[PDB]
Amino acid sequence: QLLRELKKMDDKALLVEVQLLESKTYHALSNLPKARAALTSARTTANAIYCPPK
Amino acid sequence: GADREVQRILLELLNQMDGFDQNVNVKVIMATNRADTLDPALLRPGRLDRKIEFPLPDRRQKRLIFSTIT
Amino acid sequence: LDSALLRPGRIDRKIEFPPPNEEARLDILKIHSRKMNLTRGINLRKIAELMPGASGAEVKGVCTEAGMYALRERRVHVTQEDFEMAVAKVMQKDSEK
Amino acid sequence: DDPIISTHLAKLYDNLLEQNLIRVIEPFSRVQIEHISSLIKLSKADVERKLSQM
Amino acid sequence: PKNPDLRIAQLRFLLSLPEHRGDAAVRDELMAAVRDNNMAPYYEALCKSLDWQIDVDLLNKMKKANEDELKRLDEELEDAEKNLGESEIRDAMMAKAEYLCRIGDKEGALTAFRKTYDKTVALGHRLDIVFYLLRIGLFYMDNDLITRNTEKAKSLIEEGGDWDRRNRLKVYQGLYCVAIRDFKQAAELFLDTVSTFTSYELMDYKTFVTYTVYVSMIALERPDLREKVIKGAEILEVLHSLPAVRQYLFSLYECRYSVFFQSLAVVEQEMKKDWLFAPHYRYYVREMRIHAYSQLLESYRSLTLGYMAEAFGVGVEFIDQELSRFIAAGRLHCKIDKVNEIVETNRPDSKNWQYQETIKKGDLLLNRVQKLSRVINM
Amino acid sequence: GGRRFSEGTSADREIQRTLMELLNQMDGFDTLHRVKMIMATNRPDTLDPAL
Amino acid sequence: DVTPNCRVALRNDSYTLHKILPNKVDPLVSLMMVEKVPDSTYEMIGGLDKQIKEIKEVIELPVKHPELFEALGIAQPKGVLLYGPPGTGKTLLARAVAHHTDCTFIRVSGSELVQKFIGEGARMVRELFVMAREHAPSIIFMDE
Amino acid sequence: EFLHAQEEVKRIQSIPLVIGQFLEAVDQNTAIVGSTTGSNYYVRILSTIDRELLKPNASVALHKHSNALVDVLPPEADSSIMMLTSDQKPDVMYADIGGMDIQKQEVREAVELPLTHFELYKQIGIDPPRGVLMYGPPG
Amino acid sequence: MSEKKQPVDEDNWDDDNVEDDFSNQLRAELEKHGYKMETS
Ligand SMILES: Nc1ncnc2c1ncn2[C@@H]1O[C@H](COP(=O)(O)OP(=O)(O)OP(O)(O)=S)[C@@H](O)[C@H]1O
């Protein structure tokens, strides 16, 4: 419901936040390959910003 | 005669630069301030492959260099 | 170039090189991937359809940086995550001059 | 506080067992299990099984 | 077009050697034979199968269609020497000559391969031709024509480091090593199981998994065995798919000394009716037997048949005769007693196995050089 | 000193190599000790930025 | 047997020729090694087949069949121009087709190393044709 | 007879040796060397030399008057001293450099990393580079 | 030549040694398992 709202615009640093928390919660709710893929989307998301300083 | 010697120095450098064995571990590091006055016969795949530049720093790098040196 | 070179009785053939398309980048990727240590179940068309019409030189860069990303993990095979991060790296380098 | 203590308890236990077994054996070869059962502070069933596994 | 070509030789093995198993094989052998326009490779099996009551027209119309398809290319050659490409004649009818050779016998192979081999300067086509040789020499089990260009291909491989031909020939030499009694090589060649493309010879990746477990349960004892097939994951998911594969693994690693011959009964009865194990399944069984008996007898020295009858199975006399033959076979040194009910072990077996293999290879090498040195000077 | 060139006259090559000898052996790997260097000229505009 | 540009053994006192020496220099090949283009072939240009057909019809067709052109009676062609974005196969196609049609690939762009290998560096650039008459099936290729 | 003849051959070196470099060889018992006197010679060789020890490019001992191949040298001929040998380290540590993470990491993977993990490149199929070039403004 | 005067007339072998062990007794030994699991 929200990634469609986010990738329609330009912003990228918030995709980091939502994909990161989804990589937390699928590990929490015991879905290991989906947590892997949701982490991988964040891995390739984080290599597109000049300043992700934290 | 001043340029012929530098010329054959470059020739010998290229010729022993090319065929080591493709297995002899000898890494060659070169560095100049000027990356414009280079005959591109060096800068070919096989001889000098990776290109690295050292640009001027920026705000975060200024902070880090300050924190280190000071 | 010169208009005096462009006399029609001077050059015989003039040959265009378009930037590569989806199938063209797919062929380029299936050539340059043939030297790595890949893994089954990899989708190359996703990788080709994440490129913004890259050059014929840059896909080789994607393969080499995929090799580097597999190397830093102390791994011996190359999976699609390394390719996607290599796509991110090359598309970050695309804004360098 | 660890998310998985199965790894840490069970597998570090699966190490620390033979980390004790190198202690209890290094003195002497012809060793009886019924007196080493007290030094290991454990029943001898999993001693026989785990040491056969060793 | 030799990709579906392996099921042919599969059924060639599967039909004739079991006597009662001779109906479904000849059914879908017909279903594969009267299409693809197959003519040559089945005259022996035609003398092994039935009369095929009308051989008169039903196959001669097929070979006439083959003649049309053949000399349309042999009258395309003059149309392709009009514009000499990369010898478009030979580049066209190389794979179509292997179509003709999928029809034909190995003479079309031995001339068309070496014909089109010296055409190209791009070695990928050479690699494809070498694949063609390896496959058809595997079809006629010509285990000597293929070992030439295994080496001649690894020369064409190892100008550096690649993906394609390295992993492909890993699969190819793995099948050749599992063809002969070579098991640690089969495990080392089947080590990969990661980038082994869903192929025509890998007609199921799952069958590739079954083979690489059916030789890795022999090859090494335990100093990578748990780490590959137990601590691994990419193999673990697909062995988690089939029950029977995971069955014997967790059996033998669990040491369930009675379900072993159940698992081995299923795997062995499939091993009977499976190709490239035909001189192999007999030594396989005693190999598994001694490999289980090793890890049994290693832990205990005060053991007997009174421990066998309840944790291993029944027929104490069968235990007796089996261990008697296997111990007196110079294998698994441990000494057994009569009615005092004692099976004692020899605690190191590393005195004469030290001395053993050197004399056992020097025997064959000296016997070689005897005759071969007396070959010269008449 | 000079500044730099597109290699106009062949004599300027040797001056540039001499200046790079200076630039190397004032920084190098074997660092100097106590060698204070006084440098004077009219117009430092014509000097090499590497110096 | 006294070829031009061949090493001979010379005795020292009388200066007499002693023996012809092998391992000739191959200056064109040395220049080629100095240049060191990527050596390519057909199978690594996948995705540009129409341009392949064009260069076939304009280069492979004069070499293998001059008399098709001389029967149809037009000028056999002599010039190819390649354009596109930089980095889309401008080199591998030329080098590869020149490799398959068996022509001595020559890339003289701008060095003076090259100007020493060709001639003595004296006056002009046309001496590449003097070295191209000796290896007559050859192709000359250039950058921007 | 033969062994004393072998050692009577061996009077050739003894203390006037001059150093050429091996260039080429015609065939068995005939080679080509170019001296450090600038010129280049067609010489004969001794039957003493084990022929494994030659034919890339080796500093080789020549006779003065006869100017012929005599002996092989061990690898030598200074690399401006040689390889700094004990203590000529610049004494600069890792954390002394501040904030150069991409560049330090890249120079690491280009130089320091293939120095050790050589066999990973042969398995992954990376073709690690031969030479690396740095540049930038002065300072 | 070599007329050899006539008044008179792995893959195969190591597992034939092993097959000489296998020959007379228990040829297709797979069922005798299931034969004797219920005997005793
Ligand atoms: N058809 C192709 N498919 C895939 N990669 C290619 C292809 N052609 C070239 N490359 C790669 O792209 C690089 C650059 O292509 P080139 O053929 O050298 O064109 P180019 O030299 O970039 O043209 P320039 O820069 O204007 S001289 C080559 O070094 C190859 O690695």
Cβ-Cβ contacts under 8 Å, C11 against chain G = 79-81
User: Ligand 1 centroid to C71 CA: how many Å?
Assistant: 25
Rounded Cα distance between D17 and D24, Å, is: 11
- Which of H100, H111, H135 minimises the CB distance to B27? H111
Pairing of strands E334-336, C13-16: unpaired
H121 CB-contact burial (10 Å; exposed 0-12 / middle 13-18 / buried 19+): middle
- Which of B7, B44, B45 minimises the CB distance to G113? B7
Chains E and H touch (3+ CB pairs under 8 A): yes
- CB-based contact C17 G48, cutoff 8 Å: yes
Nearest Cα neighbor of C23 from C61, C53, C66 is C53
Ligand 1 atom, smallest distance to C27 CA: 3
3-state secondary structure chain F: CCCCCCCCCCHHHHHHHHHHHHHHHHHCCCCCCCCCCCCCCCCHHHCCCCC
Cα separations in angstroms, E242 against E117, E273, G47: 43, 19, 42
Cβ-Cβ contacts under 8 Å, F49 against chain H = 137-138
| Residue E335 three-state SS | strand
Q: Are B41 and G34 in contact (CB under 8 A)?
A: yes
In terms of phi and psi (left: phi > 0; alpha: psi -120 to 50; beta: otherwise), the region of B56 is: beta
Q: Is H16 annotated as a binding residue?
A: no
User: Ligand 1 centroid to G86 CA: how many Å?
Assistant: 8
Q: Are E303 and E343 in contact (CB under 8 A)?
A: yes
Nearest Cα neighbor of G29 from G89, G120, G117, G119 is G117
Q: Nearest-CA residue of chain C relative to G52?
A: C15
Rounded Cα distance between E111 and E129, Å, is: 12
Point out residues after which chain C has a gap (C–N over 2.5 Å).
Answer: none
Please name the residue whose Cα sits nearest to atom 6 of ligand 1. Answer: C56
Nearest Cα neighbor of H23 from H77, H69, H65 is H69
Residue A38 Cα to chain centre, angstroms: 6
Q: What is the DSSP letter of H62?
A: E
The single-letter code of the amino acid at H14 is S
User: Ligand 1 centroid to C19 CA: how many Å?
Assistant: 11
Chains I and D touch (3+ CB pairs under 8 A): no
Is any Cβ of chain H less than 8 angstroms from the Cβ of B65? yes
Rounded Cα distance between E220 and C83, Å, is: 35
- What crossing angle do the helices spanning E88-103 and E106-117 adopt, rounded to 10°? 160
Rounded Cα distance between E204 and E202, Å, is: 5
Question: Residue H54 phi/psi, 5° resolution?
Answer: -125, -170
- Best residue in F4, F27, F47 for a mutation probing chain B (most B CBs within 10 Å): F4
Contacts (Cβ under 8 Å, ≥6 apart) of A19: A38, A39, A41, A42, A45
Nearest Cα neighbor of B6 from E327, E319, E76, G116 is G116
- CB-based contact H88 F29, cutoff 8 Å: yes
G96 CB-contact burial (10 Å; exposed 0-12 / middle 13-18 / buried 19+): buried
Chain F residues bordering chain H (beta-carbon distance below 8 Å) = 29-31, 49-50
Structure solved via:
cryo-EM
Residue E249 Cα to chain centre, angstroms: 21
Nearest Cα neighbor of B19 from B58, B46, B51 is B46
Nearest Cα neighbor of C36 from C80, C71, C78 is C78
Minimum distance, in Å, between the CA of residue C31 and any CA atom of chain H: 14
Contacts (Cβ under 8 Å, ≥6 apart) of H53: H72
What is the full DSSP assignment across E303-326? B-HHHHHHHT-S-HHHHHHHHHHH
What is the full DSSP assignment across E53-115? S--SSTTHHHHHHHHHHHHHHTTTHHHHSSS-SSSHHHHHHHHHHHHHHHHS-HHHHHHHHHH
- CB-based contact C10 G79, cutoff 8 Å: yes
From C25, C28, C32, C35, mutation site for ligand 1 pocket: most ligand atoms within 8 A of C-beta: C28
Rounded Cα distance between E304 and E311, Å, is: 11
Nearest Cα neighbor of E48 from E28, E76, E19, E24 is E19
User: Ligand 1 centroid to H119 CA: how many Å?
Assistant: 29
Q: Is G119 annotated as a binding residue?
A: no
3-state secondary structure I1-40: CCCCCCCCCCCCCHHHHHHHHHCCCCCCCCHHHHHHCCCC
Cβ-Cβ contacts under 8 Å, H117 against chain C = 71
E374 CB-contact burial (10 Å; exposed 0-12 / middle 13-18 / buried 19+): exposed
Q: Are G60 and E85 in contact (CB under 8 A)?
A: yes
Cβ-Cβ contacts under 8 Å, C37 against chain E = 163, 195
Cβ-Cβ contacts under 8 Å, C65 against chain A = none
Contacts (Cβ under 8 Å, ≥6 apart) of E187: E212, E215, E216, E218, E219, E220
Q: Is H34 annotated as a binding residue?
A: no
User: Which residues line ligand 1 at a C-beta cut-off of 6 Å?
Assistant: C 28, 56-57, 60; G 38, 45, 47-48, 86-87, 89-92, 143
Q: Is H136 annotated as a binding residue?
A: yes
Q: What is the DSSP letter of D6?
A: I
| Residue H18 three-state SS | strand
Neighbours of chain B (3+ CB pairs under 8 A): F, G, H
| Residue D13 three-state SS | helix
**Site of tokens 């290094």:** D26
Cβ-Cβ contacts under 8 Å, G49 against chain E = none
**Torsion on CA atoms B43, B44, B46, B47, rounded to nearest 10:** -30
- CB-based contact H124 C36, cutoff 8 Å: yes
- CB-based contact I40 E314, cutoff 8 Å: yes
Residue H17 Cα to chain centre, angstroms: 20
Question: Residue F21 phi/psi, 5° resolution?
Answer: -60, -45
The single-letter code of the amino acid at D2 is D
Rounded Cα distance between G100 and E83, Å, is: 15
Rounded Cα distance between E282 and I19, Å, is: 8
E333-360 CB burial, b ≥16 within 10 A, e <16? bbebeeeeeebebeeeeeeeeeeeeeee
Q: Are H21 and H34 in contact (CB under 8 A)?
A: yes
Rounded Cα distance between E297 and E304, Å, is: 10
Rounded Cα distance between E250 and C80, Å, is: 32
Cα separations in angstroms, E285 against E261, E267, E294, I10, I26: 9, 10, 14, 19, 12
Rounded Cα distance between H53 and H74, Å, is: 9
Q: Are B37 and H126 in contact (CB under 8 A)?
A: no
Chains D and G touch (3+ CB pairs under 8 A): no
- CB-based contact H99 B53, cutoff 8 Å: no
Rounded Cα distance between H130 and B19, Å, is: 10
Cβ-Cβ contacts under 8 Å, G87 against chain C = 55-58
**Site of tokens 């030979």:** E90
Rounded Cα distance between D34 and D32, Å, is: 6
Cβ count within 10 A of residue E41: 21
How many residues can be counted in chain D? 54
Q: Are C37 and C77 in contact (CB under 8 A)?
A: yes
- CB-based contact A44 C91, cutoff 8 Å: no
Cβ count within 10 A of residue E165: 20
Neighbours of chain H (3+ CB pairs under 8 A): B, C, E, F, G
| Residue G8 three-state SS | strand
Q: What is the DSSP letter of G29?
A: H
- Sign for the pseudo-dihedral over CA of C85, C86, C89, C91: negative
The stretches of chain H forming alpha helices (DSSP H) are 2-9, 101-107, 113-116, 118-124
Cβ count within 10 A of residue E365: 9
A47 CB-contact burial (10 Å; exposed 0-12 / middle 13-18 / buried 19+): middle
Cα separations in angstroms, B61 against B56, B58, B64, B69, C93: 9, 5, 5, 12, 20
Contacts (Cβ under 8 Å, ≥6 apart) of E201: E6, E135, E171, E175
Is any Cβ of chain G less than 8 angstroms from the Cβ of C29? no
**Site of tokens 């059996």:** E251
**Element (DSSP H or E) covering residue E175:** helix E164-179
Question: Residue G97 phi/psi, 5° resolution?
Answer: -65, -35
User: Ligand 1 centroid to E31 CA: how many Å?
Assistant: 49
**Element (DSSP H or E) covering residue A7:** helix A3-7
Cα-only R_g, chain G:
20
- What crossing angle do the helices spanning C80-93 and C58-72 adopt, rounded to 10°? 130
Please name the residue whose Cα sits nearest to atom 30 of ligand 1. Answer: C57
3-state secondary structure E195-216: CCCCCCCCCCHHHHHHHHHHHH
Q: Are E195 and C38 in contact (CB under 8 A)?
A: yes
Cβ count within 10 A of residue H114: 17
